[PDB]
Amino acid sequence: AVPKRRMSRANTRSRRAQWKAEAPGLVTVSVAGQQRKVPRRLLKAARLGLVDLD
Amino acid sequence: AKGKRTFQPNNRRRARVHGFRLRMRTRAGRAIVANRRSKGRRALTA
Amino acid sequence: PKPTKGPRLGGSSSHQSALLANLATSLFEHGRIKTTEPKARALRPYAEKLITHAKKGALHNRREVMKKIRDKDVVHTLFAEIGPFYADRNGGYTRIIKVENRKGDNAPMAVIELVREK
Amino acid sequence: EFPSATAKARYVRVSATKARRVIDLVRGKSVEEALDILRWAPQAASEPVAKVIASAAANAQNNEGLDPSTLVVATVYADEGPTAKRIRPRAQGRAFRIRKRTSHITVIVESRPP
RNA sequence: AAGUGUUUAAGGGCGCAUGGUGGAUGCCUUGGCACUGGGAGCCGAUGAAGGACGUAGGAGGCUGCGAUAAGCCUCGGGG
RNA sequence: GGUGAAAAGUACCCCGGGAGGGGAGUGAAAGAGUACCUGAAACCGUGCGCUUACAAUCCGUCAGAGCCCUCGACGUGUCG
RNA sequence: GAGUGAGAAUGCAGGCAUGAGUAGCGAUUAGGCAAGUGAGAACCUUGCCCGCCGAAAGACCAAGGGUUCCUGGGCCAGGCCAGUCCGCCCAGGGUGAGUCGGGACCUAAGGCGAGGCCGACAGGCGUAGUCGAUGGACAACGGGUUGAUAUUCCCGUACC
RNA sequence: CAGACCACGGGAUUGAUAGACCAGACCUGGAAGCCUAGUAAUAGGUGCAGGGAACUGGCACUAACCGGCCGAAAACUUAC
């Protein structure tokens, strides 16, 4: 089937607002003296030096 | 399948069926060459 | 070990078996292989069970690890170094560390290591 | 008005909507926090946004002589840019239009008090 | 105890402010159109019309030119 | 088709790999930056004000509380 | 004096929305790891494994394409992602024949066709000729070589 | 054993949540090696052997982490 009518801008906007990214939760880690922020999942990798903290 | 497309290229056949010598052979072809020249086409024939 | 619940890792059962064999080979060869997180999770049991065969010195376990691994260098490595190395450790021979996602398809990545405290 | 710095990454090869998807994660945030969020955000459109924000902070530090720690992304928005029109051939020899969209990402960072 | 009342915005709407895209509008023009008055009213085997390939110290297009190849000679204008 | 009168088309700083930008400069103008006169609408943002998650809406119109701004007045914050 | 007023012509052109950040991302082989390069790497390089074709998905001709080949650079466009890679982009280089395949040899079908015959004209035919390979005749084989050419170049030995 | 996602339900070191390991239960049906009977195919012993997934119980050996974001109140009238 095909859209029978142009969707009103209100409906378009309301449905399009649902396409959004979730902000990653950032945890502090101590690497090389300075403090960096990485996902808690990568916290162990950062501690073990496995994360390329630019 | 049999997916042979219509244009099967062949340069000899192209030249002998649409080429300059063919076009100049007959009155109609000479007229076509002259009409094409009058239009200004760069490629008067094959 | 426990089969794969969902669709198999490589794209088929045979390719998953081959992929687990190759990942186990690399894991035993380097001690540290980076691969997509689901591959690492599937490999942890596979590799730990090969190491279980290697931990006990027997020609029968030699042949079992061989019918899994098919890499004589790494089979010797197992049965000579990694066998006696885990003589006292009872399970959990390896470790999974989740690392950044792959920039290409944003896949979850994880490194599998062999444990080395004792 | 708090002192401010601008930075316009123009003709970025990212659809304006996708640039906005990542801008919303950071608008109003500190510059440091915005850069961390963009660093760990899966969205590939985050790299252009992070570069625009970093350029805004760099302009603040150098051209405006502001303290970086006091900067927050005050107003960041991505506008549509020129669209290239390509053709995708489809079944029964029907040509559909593909739109290679671009975006102008404008960042304006303000030096707010602690 | 029973009644009276906030204030939410995930999103949406409207107005305004600011932009982006886009290339309308205004004002133009290198081009075109329609004519006026004149000249020429033919060119070609002394090879035409029209081209191909070359030709500049340097890659192509246009222009010119033709292995004497953006040119050769003579006579005039010009500074 | 249209930068500018003139290319004066950003010697040398900064962020970036680049793109692009912020400085600084030229310019009468950069609200003219070889994407360039003017720069409409469609369309896409962002900011602010009001409004909306008990509601059945050809999306307006007429009454219209509330809220937010503006012009006067009186010079109490309330009336026009 | 009018190209004088558009909202409709499944009107025409350009720019844009809606659908929608959606379907799809093109078979029936399948990738993985390590290490490099890089700003960036699932996709490039190398190594090792794994797997796929193997009367081919291998090798080479012809047609066709036309520089796509090689070297060095580039990564804005294209590649259905990204790309440091590329059949993309830029410059330079690169194709060597007495024997190979053609012509200079020959004809078939067919074409054209001096005169010519036929036809109001235009022209239709066609003899002699003349072209016309897909055929007939016709002298070269091994090895090596470059980043790109090889029965061509080179070496050795043959043949017009 | 909850499930398209999300959600729901457990665990998160003060832990048995998952994996591994150790057992067991099951499935298969007698592993490899060696020895013996064999001119050999093969057979017998070692040996309810060996291989193993989902079920069960043990076991912190591996991973549940030196963490992060949210998240609590104008009052007033009347009676008691």
From Swiss-Prot, chain A:
Any one cellular-component term (Gene Ontology)? large ribosomal subunit
Query: Which BP terms does GO give this entry?
Result: translation
Alphabetically sorted, this entry's keywords are: Ribonucleoprotein, Ribosomal protein
- Cite a single GO MF annotation: structural constituent of ribosome
Where in this protein does the record put region Disordered?
Answer: 1-19
Q: Does the keyword 4Fe-4S apply?
A: no
Q: Where is the composition biased (Basic residues)?
A: 1-18
User: Is Iron-sulfur tagged as a keyword?
Assistant: no
Q: What Pfam families would the database entry show?
A: Ribosomal_L32p (PF01783)
Record's InterPro entries?
A: Ribosomal_bL32, Ribosomal_zn-bd
- Give the family, as the similarity comment puts it: Belongs to the bacterial ribosomal protein bL32 family.
Query: What is the protein's name according to its record?
Result: Large ribosomal subunit protein bL32
Q: Which organism is it from?
A: Mycolicibacterium smegmatis (strain ATCC 700084 / mc(2)155)
Curated annotation (Swiss-Prot), chain B:
Keywords of the record, alphabetical order, are: Ribonucleoprotein, Ribosomal protein
Give GO terms for biological process. Answer: translation
Q: Name one GO molecular function term.
A: structural constituent of ribosome
Gene3D superfamilies for the chain: 1.10.287.3980
* GO CC terms in record: ribonucleoprotein complex; ribosome
Please name the InterPro entries in this protein's record: Ribosomal_bL34, Ribosomal_bL34_CS
Q: What does the sequence similarity comment in the record state about its family?
A: Belongs to the bacterial ribosomal protein bL34 family.
Q: Which PANTHER family match?
A: LARGE RIBOSOMAL SUBUNIT PROTEIN BL34M, MITOCHONDRIAL RIBOSOMAL PROTEIN 34 FAMILY MEMBER
Q: What is this protein called?
A: Large ribosomal subunit protein bL34
Protein source organism:
Mycolicibacterium smegmatis (strain ATCC 700084 / mc(2)155) (Mycobacterium smegmatis)
Please name the gene that encodes this protein: rpmH
UniProtKB/Swiss-Prot annotation, chain C:
The residues forming the signal peptide are: none
Transmembrane: present as a keyword of the record?
no
Name the source's superkingdom. Bacteria
Q: Name one GO molecular function term.
A: structural constituent of ribosome
Entry keyword set: Ribonucleoprotein, Ribosomal protein
Gene Ontology CC: cytosolic large ribosomal subunit
> Which Gene Ontology BP terms does the record give?
translation
What is annotated about its quaternary structure and interactions? Part of the 50S ribosomal subunit. Contacts protein L32.
Hey, which family's this protein in?
A: Belongs to the bacterial ribosomal protein bL17 family.
Q: What is this protein called?
A: Large ribosomal subunit protein bL17
From Swiss-Prot, chain D:
Q: What is this protein called?
A: Large ribosomal subunit protein uL22
A single Gene Ontology biological process assigned to it is: translation
Note whether Repeat occurs among the keywords: no
- The domain of life for this entry's organism is Bacteria
Q: Which GO terms describe its molecular function?
A: rRNA binding; structural constituent of ribosome
Question: What family, per the record?
Answer: Belongs to the universal ribosomal protein uL22 family.
User: Quick one: a GO cellular component term?
Assistant: cytosolic large ribosomal subunit
Oligomeric form and interacting partners? Part of the 50S ribosomal subunit.
Keyword Ribonucleoprotein included in the entry's annotation:
yes
Q: Which UniProt keywords apply?
A: Ribonucleoprotein, Ribosomal protein, RNA-binding, rRNA-binding
What is the role of this chain?
This protein binds specifically to 23S rRNA; its binding is stimulated by other ribosomal proteins, e.g. L4, L17, and L20. It is important during the early stages of 50S assembly. It makes multiple contacts with different domains of the 23S rRNA in the assembled 50S subunit and ribosome.
